[PDB]
Design an enzyme around this catalytic site. Structure first.
Site, PDB file in Angstrom:
ATOM      1  N   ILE A 159       4.131  -2.926   1.496  1.00 10.54           N
ATOM      2  CA  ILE A 159       2.633  -2.433   1.635  1.00 10.54           C
ATOM      3  C   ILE A 159       2.917  -1.530   2.976  1.00 10.54           C
ATOM      4  CG2 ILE A 159       0.120  -3.379   1.754  1.00 10.54           C
ATOM      5  CD1 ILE A 159       1.214  -5.791   1.100  1.00 10.54           C
TER       6      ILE A 159
ATOM      7  N   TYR B  83       4.623  -0.442  15.748  1.00  7.77           N
ATOM      8  CA  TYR B  83       5.451  -0.972  15.872  1.00  7.77           C
ATOM      9  C   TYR B  83       5.391  -2.574  14.680  1.00  7.77           C
ATOM     10  CZ  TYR B  83       1.342  -3.142  18.892  1.00  7.77           C
ATOM     11  OH  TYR B  83       0.405  -3.682  18.932  1.00  7.77           O
ATOM     12  N   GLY B  84       4.791  -2.181  14.357  1.00  4.92           N
ATOM     13  CA  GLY B  84       4.506  -3.426  13.020  1.00  4.92           C
ATOM     14  C   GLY B  84       4.453  -2.660  11.700  1.00  4.92           C
TER      15      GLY B  84
ATOM     16  N   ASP C 294     -13.124  -1.649  17.748  1.00  3.02           N
ATOM     17  CA  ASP C 294     -12.387  -0.951  16.958  1.00  3.02           C
ATOM     18  C   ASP C 294     -12.881  -1.481  15.289  1.00  3.02           C
ATOM     19  OD1 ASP C 294     -11.289   1.213  15.728  1.00  3.02           O
ATOM     20  OD2 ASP C 294      -9.108   0.688  16.243  1.00  3.02           O
TER      21      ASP C 294
HETATM   22  N1  LIG Z   1       0.684  -1.058   8.421  1.00  2.00           N
HETATM   23  N2  LIG Z   1      -0.603  -1.703   8.595  1.00  2.00           N
HETATM   24  N3  LIG Z   1      -1.119  -2.118   8.411  1.00  2.00           N
HETATM   25  C1  LIG Z   1      -2.976  -1.420   7.199  1.00  2.00           C
HETATM   26  C2  LIG Z   1      -1.771  -1.969   5.868  1.00  2.00           C
HETATM   27  O1  LIG Z   1      -1.091  -3.198   5.871  1.00  2.00           O
HETATM   28  C3  LIG Z   1      -2.028  -3.651   5.072  1.00  2.00           C
HETATM   29  N4  LIG Z   1      -2.853  -5.125   5.475  1.00  2.00           N
HETATM   30  C4  LIG Z   1      -3.559  -5.892   6.586  1.00  2.00           C
HETATM   31  S1  LIG Z   1      -2.933  -4.871   8.113  1.00  2.00           S
HETATM   32  C5  LIG Z   1      -3.951  -6.254   9.535  1.00  2.00           C
HETATM   33  C6  LIG Z   1      -2.765  -7.067   9.604  1.00  2.00           C
HETATM   34  O2  LIG Z   1      -2.170  -6.544  10.930  1.00  2.00           O
HETATM   35  N5  LIG Z   1      -2.894  -8.005   8.776  1.00  2.00           N
HETATM   36  C7  LIG Z   1      -1.618  -9.217  10.011  1.00  2.00           C
HETATM   37  C8  LIG Z   1      -0.944  -9.677   8.608  1.00  2.00           C
HETATM   38  S2  LIG Z   1      -0.665  -8.362   7.409  1.00  2.00           S
HETATM   39  N6  LIG Z   1      -3.290  -7.320   5.974  1.00  2.00           N
HETATM   40  C9  LIG Z   1      -2.993  -7.513   5.595  1.00  2.00           C
HETATM   41  C10 LIG Z   1      -3.422  -8.370   4.224  1.00  2.00           C
HETATM   42  N7  LIG Z   1      -3.558  -9.955   5.218  1.00  2.00           N
HETATM   43  N8  LIG Z   1      -3.343  -8.168   2.978  1.00  2.00           N
HETATM   44  C11 LIG Z   1      -2.714  -7.301   2.710  1.00  2.00           C
HETATM   45  N9  LIG Z   1      -2.865  -6.681   2.904  1.00  2.00           N
HETATM   46  C12 LIG Z   1      -2.506  -6.265   4.630  1.00  2.00           C
HETATM   47  C13 LIG Z   1      -4.077  -2.942   5.445  1.00  2.00           C
HETATM   48  O3  LIG Z   1      -4.515  -3.196   4.004  1.00  2.00           O
HETATM   49  C14 LIG Z   1      -2.648  -1.139   4.997  1.00  2.00           C
HETATM   50  O4  LIG Z   1      -2.476  -1.328   3.686  1.00  2.00           O
END
Ligand SMILES: N=[N+]=NC[C@H]1O[C@@H](n2c(SCC(=O)NCCS)nc3c(N)ncnc32)[C@H](O)[C@@H]1O
EC number: 2.7.11.24
Length: 342
Positions: free
Chosen positions: A21, A26-27, A139
């Site tokens: 996605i 670092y993630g 933020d």
């Molecule tokens: N790499 N990175 N970050 C940005 C991308 O990741 C997408 N994103 C996030 S970021 C918030 C986070 O760190 N959550 C921790 C568990 S994933 N959360 C999402 C979710 N729950 N469902 C679907 N897409 C998610 C964001 O829209 C973008 O596409």
């Protein structure tokens, strides 16, 4: 273990069938099938333990999200990590899968007035809960507003959050670095450390303006340019508002500027609902003491179709890391994630 673009996701056996996605410093974020709940979820792999600042932000995110429970704040479904600190190199945070976020949505989609109103209501409903816990998000921006396929909105990413501290908010001129540049209140550059709730309201106002036109309202090209854009639209601050800035370097900078007239909101946004622009003006108020607060914003006529204080809950008890070595932070992250073991 399945891999996603060079990244191993040790998330089995509960979570399978992964798809990339997004990615970070670092993630990495993937979608995955939750074999228990029979639904696809989002999983973020975090590898923070070599860097103290990363450990700080990770601990903040986990501690806050595990304590919050609110429809407009993303929840943590599960946390996956090794059974021992010694073996723990990564942490995986599992959340509900959200279709998109407001940043991605605004790249290509114009919003109806009904969607702008609904989104703003949900942002402010979530922010009311956050602020009622004495927490500042610090933020807020479109990419931290997740959206599912039915346009339920959930605030995410609390890694930069702090407990409010208005008695220690004052500081000097051009020193502070709070929030993402385009969403950063004018006082951050002038005399504020970003320890008061008004910092978040400014960001929401910036988001509202962006929802109205699909363009950032204050697109500063660098840290010092940001105040130029804000003042270019709000115009010169009043004597009363300057008198509230006791710091001489900050006040004299503003006094050194030529007089600038306010640009009317309805010329910037000729299609916008007049009530939306009235609320926008109150959130994008220069003086943070005059700026509308979250509960006033919920009560504004623009949101009358949704406003219901008995259905706008607050936190059961408020919150009441810079000095800790990364080893202590790792131990705290291990302890905070134990409830999910396994
Ligand atoms: N790499 N990175 N970050 C940005 C991308 O990741 C997408 N994103 C996030 S970021 C918030 C986070 O760190 N959550 C921790 C568990 S994933 N959360 C999402 C979710 N729950 N469902 C679907 N897409 C998610 C964001 O829209 C973008 O596409």
């Amino acid at each position: 273990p399945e891999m996603v673009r060079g990244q191993v996701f040790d998330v089995g056996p509960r979570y399978t069938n992964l798809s990339y996605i997004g990615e970070g410093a670092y993630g990495m974020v993937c979608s995955a099938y939750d074999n228990l709940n029979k639904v696809r979820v989002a999983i973020k792999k975090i590898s923070p333990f070599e860097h103290q600042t990363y450990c700080q932000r990770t601990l903040r995110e986990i501690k806050i999200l595990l304590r919050f429970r609110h429809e407009n704040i993303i929840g943590i479904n599960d946390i996956i990590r090794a059974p021992t600190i010694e073996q723990m190199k990564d942490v995986y945070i599992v959340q509900d899968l959200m279709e998109t976020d407001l940043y991605k949505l605004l790249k290509t989609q114009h919003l109806s007035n009904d969607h702008i109103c609904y989104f703003l209501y949900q942002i402010l409903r979530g922010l009311k809960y956050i602020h009622s816990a004495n927490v500042l998000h610090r933020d807020l921006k479109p990419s931290n507003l997740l959206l599912n396929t039915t346009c339920d909105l959930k605030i995410c990413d609390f890694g930069l959050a702090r407990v409010a501290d208005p008695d220690h908010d004052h500081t000097g001129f051009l020193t502070e670095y709070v929030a993402t540049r385009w969403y950063r209140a004018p006082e951050i550059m002038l005399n504020s450390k970003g320890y008061t709730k008004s910092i978040d309201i400014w960001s929401v106002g910036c988001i509202l303006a962006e929802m109205l036109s699909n363009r950032p309202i204050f697109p500063g090209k660098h840290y010092l340019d940001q105040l130029n854009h804000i003042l270019g639209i709000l115009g010169s601050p009043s004597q009363e508002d300057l008198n509230c800035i006791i710091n001489l370097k900050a006040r004299n900078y503003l006094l050194s500027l030529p007089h600038k007239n306010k640009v009317p909101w309805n010329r910037l946004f000729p299609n916008a609902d007049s009530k939306a622009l009235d609320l926008l003006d109150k959130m994008l108020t220069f003086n943070p003491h005059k700026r509308i607060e979250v509960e006033q914003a919920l009560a504004h006529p623009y949101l009358e179709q949704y406003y219901d204080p008995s259905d706008e809950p607050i936190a059961e008890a408020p919150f009441k890391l810079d000095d800790l070595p990364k080893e202590k932070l790792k131990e705290l992250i291990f302890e905070e994630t134990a409830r999910f073991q396994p």
